[PDB]
Paper text:
For the fragment screening campaign, the chosen crystal system was obtained in a citrate condition and hexagonal space group P63, containing two NSP15 monomers in the asymmetric unit arranged in a dihedral symmetry, which can be symmetrically expanded to reveal the full hexameric form of NendoU inside the crystal lattice. The structure of NendoU in complex with dsRNA reveals that the positive charges of Arg135 and Lys191 side chains are key for positioning long nucleic acids into the active sites of NendoU.
The NSP15 endoribonuclease enzyme, known as NendoU, is highly conserved and plays a critical role in the ability of the virus to evade the immune system. NendoU is a three-domain 34 kDa protein that was demonstrated to form a barrel-shaped hexamer in solution by the assembly of two trimers. The oligomerization is mostly driven by the contacts of the N-terminal (ND) and the middle (MD) domains, while the C-terminal domain (CD) carries the canonical catalytic residues from the endonuclease family. In terms of substrate specificity, NendoU of the coronaviruses is described to cleave a great variety of single- and double-stranded RNAs in an Mn2+-dependent reaction, by hydrolyzing the 3′ end of pyrimidines, with a strong preference for uracil, and to release 2′,3′-cyclic phosphate and 5′-hydroxyl ends as products.
Numbering used by the authors:
A (entry chain A), B (entry chain B), C (entry chain B), D (entry chain A), E (entry chain A): -1 to 346
Write the structure that this text describes.
């Protein structure tokens, strides 16, 4: 017997939906769910989704509370739907997927991923849940994560980090590095070799390699010398040119991180969703240099150096395809006389 | 085990709350309750109250569906709250009372009227429900209806009509005429002699006496002649004077019914609620005669005639008090040279 | 080049979406679309659906304005979606189907019904639109209407009436009687023999047979005599029994039409949607007789007589199944000593 | 002459309601109050309450702007209502009490606490306001605060801290330590001996005893030695065990404070109201250790040490009742071989 | 062809409105605009204005993204409207002006500032845009900014700082110091000599003169000695008196900044708009000293010292008019025996 009042009972007593039995009285007004405590209304949930408030509330309450892949990964792998859980998109305060399977009666298209409506959809499977590996094997389309080996299935090692209740972390008391597997049209698919973005914040940025410690700590010319980067235009691409009204380059998070220690800036996240490459409308507070569409990626600097050094530098412009978070990221590479002018995530 | 979804199940399957087990999926968007029937949303309920939508939905579902006293009677008797039912106020599309007893967890102030919070409240008790005559005996404050005698109480015989799911009617297959009993601070009251308003509609007005039949058939002058009404200002009070910009008189529903057969008019119900006297801002379409605050009452014409013939006509202006629907209705009586000038429910 | 403002232009200038170029200024406040005409705002559209206001506005604008099958027929045939039109459900003030094909960018699951997401969906195809009979041939699942023969398909002749901009009618200047054809998993179905409900209103009820004329004119006893209906419980089933608190019988629209000429009653439509059988919570004003869940169907009286005379009357109670509007309507038949006691659409 | 526009006049000119006379024009849209400044709308108030926006606005404007007891205290003492002021709950952005006395015409149940409706309610009285001590003496139920001595009334010394416009502080230019007194059913009640929670934030945590300076500054084993805490499981209870997927212990705010210097964590406040014991759904960012329902209290460490040391350690499990903020807080005490396994606020 | 979907296309692809062609599907619900990315809704804009959501969205998208005068300046100069751009008020999340010219069809009063409706309005002109200087010359009323010299027009040097996408900054890669000119009734007006407020935050405060470095760094008595301020009551006016329940003085931002390093405090911005003098309801966290209406201005300390030293100190009270941000700010000057008691922005 699922119900609004039972969902709120679990939220109040168990911090989330926990299969417990019971009911608390609830009031819904506009987009907010409340419950009486000591005779007054206490807010339990503000619906920021495009779903009816009582539906969003239940989905939220039923969010997966184990570490799960970050939404950008699931998106990059073409996931449409999850088997019998909810991947909550903490960046959008909303379900990451439109529909559900076996979760909620207003949004379910199916009780079980074996139902024929699920066969064209890429269904997300969690091998930490009993039976879900088997259900991947039987599904026409899907993405499977496991903590270990699945007999016969060639694994792809995913990122180190996963999301636990909206916190992106590398697990220590829990495991966040998964094997990933994918199936299209009944056929297991080979996951490409790939880099992974690092998912760091600008407020909390911590380097993760001696090279990155050097970038944060050394002056620009020292660092460029020490890692033999002459002619690669990190002055522009990574350090950022703030001298003109249009802010130049500045496409690596670590570069933003360096600048942020010195002076603040505004990042307007005008498409606020999780993705491998982010676009910001950036305004530098110190200089007033700015740019409407500044693509930023958080690659380990080591990885970005390896990508740019591996490039042929003998054409004016070309599109360079790099596989990142399993998706194929296009960059624009502009050169002159065998040195880099600029290299940036291509704006689409 | 009360729940939004169970209430909706009862509505969908039983036309109203009926204590049945079950659940349907529900969605709430702003003030409307919908349910999914075969993949599309069907409107179950639009909240017109000042309560949270899911709360109003449940009180509406749990409305009393037996003939019950009209809200105007309950209010005139000082009823605060009903015992274990909801008197639905179809004139306000809202619960007639703030709080409930033993009905709904969000609005209940008690489960049983015997709890101490109910003692100072005038509680409504329905003798047709097992045990409620008893509970009225224990109750410090209350109003009781019954269909027949109660041993040791003198009854007050109420109106002929009652409200069945919002239709006011004189029951032929069900009883609508109740015995009334009232208790203030543990003492059974002697209810006053009272007239009753008749609760008719302007559109479907039906005479209930030979005098009313004659009023509808005859011409003004004939009717006034037959019933010896010269000098009582019915021309003004009951027929209505449409010759000036201020619509004159027209304070008796039968007079509005008579005019509405010939030519129509606008009645603006600017305090929409059930009350013994109604105030309308009335605009006569044929003539443009209008009045901002036109008090209207539906008295049996014979009872109105009795009231007006029972007054002293020798002072220019005074307040005349008349018990109606158990409440004291003040009238203004204006006279000149021993005849009536006007007589109207006071606009105080 | 679809846009809010272009849709509004079409509404304002063409009464509906018509593919015209142009733009008017629009403003959206909560669920209402307005447009500026000479400096003030005029209401174009109030959203009563569960879709976003601008989305519902566009689907409403793009409604099919040719006579189309009533929604109850489409649902009974299992239609999921329409090919390149919107069947507007005037009973719910909402789109009849969740999704669209080739109509609206927010709701389209495809541009053409031939895309693979449509193959498992039962698609509605209108033979009056060039190419759609063809598309029905390629379609794995579908329902097709036409005005005339289709070479190589046996037709099923549908109802006389269809819905034109929300008015159900039997077309005299346009055709409303369609041939129906259905395909499940690539196989043309043989549609069952079926009766059709007549889709009449209680207010403007018009007899469509000499028996129905007689039913309206004659007294109960005469009519029952003329048509040899003794022992079939029409007194209860069709005339309705208003003598007890439970309103008895009254399951056939013509019986409600007959009563409504004499005295009025409340029909509460608590699941407002188009369906072959309707459930009303009905309160008779003259008598106070009432019933929470009164199933009503509008069958030609002759067809109802044929159904009831085609049953075995020898068991106390059983389920009688009758194809109507192409769907299986269960009835309860109650008999005693070889005569009918009652017979009603099952309240399951 | 109270009015929306007068309330807004005071807000604009006096920062809050100040009995001043005057009016500014106001516009209300959805849940927000605005006023024109220099021809544009400036937001004055966003209603986060379940009250009508214009009502919440007035209550907010009339909030008590003297230091007042924190809402958890008033709750723990059973306060239902305040005499002639509003205790604004800054943590819920809402009135702490449902109704008022002498404040606001939509929410008043009474103009004065002597009215008989107030007698069953525990009314909050402020002896800094003239007459309110006397009104406590006459009230059947109440809680009284004073700055000094009340002849005959045995005092209870309240917490050091009070809330001033939502800032919890120990007063220096103002007095925040009150005498508390309580009355149930006409009878002064003896307030229990009690500890008080410290009301500290995790961002702003300052130790308040040499012991607490030691906890923050020393390593875990040093501190446990220096205060002879071997066998008392502060390793678990206070320091927190982050080694397993379920975060172990961690029920004292100061322990959260220590960890927060090292690494951040997420505290989901899923019942956001003021209370003596808080429940969080906690996710540790460094380790990914987490717990759905982690009870946290902010006792001075000295006080928590005194509580746990005073316990008999010779049973496996028992419920230990401790009086905190005047309410009786249950703890679970789990022991083995005369040492503490775990000791935590009992989850209800 | 302007449209909701075209505006959203520009927002998504260009970070703001950029004249580009194209459309994305959009959904509007309540006050929020969304668009599909990867099958789910992503929030593009939350309407905090009193305009219809789709109108506010377009105005926002069309905001001027060059450095522009801070709204307080435009207000102080009497600007009603901007020529062919939108000055977005980032402090109110709303257009700074009610109407537009040549921007948006719901809010435009004119396509061009030469239209006769614009002649009484003070129109804001931007000489960085071609033709706009000329349009100032022809306008009956206006305010013009330029980066350089305009032949014949006597300039006023504006503030050093301007606002770029809501960041107030002194330009280095861009120019933020403008010449200002004003016209009333066809006649160029002489802008007064004036100080300028510094527009600093309390979190980010940086001194801007050796004097201000001294104020932040030195003790109170040192600083007062070093700059010969004895008898000028900076102890009160600038340092702030926290000893009594009413917080004394404290009207210079730098004084708040000093205190904030030591201890925090609450500033309730109860009229949140940009202005030259701000009013806060201030609560000091350390002492609980507070004040409902504390006027604060951010003058360079040098400038404030120069203002107060220039005053005659020989009257008890007088109104002192100082021109700041071009508007005439009244101060109250209270003296005794030729020393300053208090000096503060006059409360109106
Ligand atoms: C306090 N007295 C009282 O209630 N009396 C009574 C009530 C109901 C029926 C008959 C009775 F006598
Ligand atoms: C799969 N078969 C099929 O569709 N057949 C057919 C369809 C429409 C008209 C005539 C036909 F023969």
């Amino acid at each position: 017997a699922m119900s609004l009042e039972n969902v709120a009972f679990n939220v109040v007593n168990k911090g989330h939906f926990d299969g417990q039995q019971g009911e608390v009285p609830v009031s819904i007004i506009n987009n907010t769910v409340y419950t009486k405590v000591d005779g007054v209304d206490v807010e339990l949930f503000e619906n920021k989704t495009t779903l009816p408030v009582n539906v969003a509330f239940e989905l939220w309450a039923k969010r997966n509370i184990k570490p799960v892949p970050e939404v950008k990964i699931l998106n990059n792998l073409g996931v449409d739907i999850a088997a019998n859980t909810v991947i909550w998109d903490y960046k959008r305060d909303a379900p990451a997927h439109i529909s559900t399977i076996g979760v909620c009666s207003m949004t379910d298209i199916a009780k079980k991923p074996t139902e024929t409506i699920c066969a064209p959809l890429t269904v997300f499977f969690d091998g930490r849940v009993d039976g879900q590996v088997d259900l991947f094997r039987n599904a026409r389309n899907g993405v499977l994560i496991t903590e270990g080996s699945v007999k016969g299935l060639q694994p792809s090692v995913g990122p180190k980090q996963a999301s636990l209740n909206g916190v992106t972390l590398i697990g220590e008391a829990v495991k966040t590095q998964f094997n990933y597997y994918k199936k299209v049209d009944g056929v297991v698919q080979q996951l490409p070799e790939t880099y992974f973005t690092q998912s760091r914040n600008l407020q909390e940025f911590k380097p993760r390699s001696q090279m990155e410690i050097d970038f944060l700590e050394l002056a620009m010319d020292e660092f460029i010398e020490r890692y033999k980067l002459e002619g690669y235009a990190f002055e522009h691409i990574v350090y950022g040119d703030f001298s003109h009204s249009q802010l130049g380059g500045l496409h690596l998070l670590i570069g933003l991180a360096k600048r942020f220690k010195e002076s603040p800036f505004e990042l307007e996240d005008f498409i606020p969703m999780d993705s491998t490459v982010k676009n910001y409308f950036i305004t530098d507070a110190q200089t007033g240099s700015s740019k409407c569409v500044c693509s930023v990626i958080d690659l380990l600097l080591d990885d970005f150096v390896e990508i740019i050094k591996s490039q042929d530098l003998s054409v004016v412009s070309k599109v360079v395809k790099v596989t990142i978070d399993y998706t194929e990221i296009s960059f624009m590479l502009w050169c002159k006389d065998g040195h880099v002018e600029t290299f940036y995530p291509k704006l689409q």
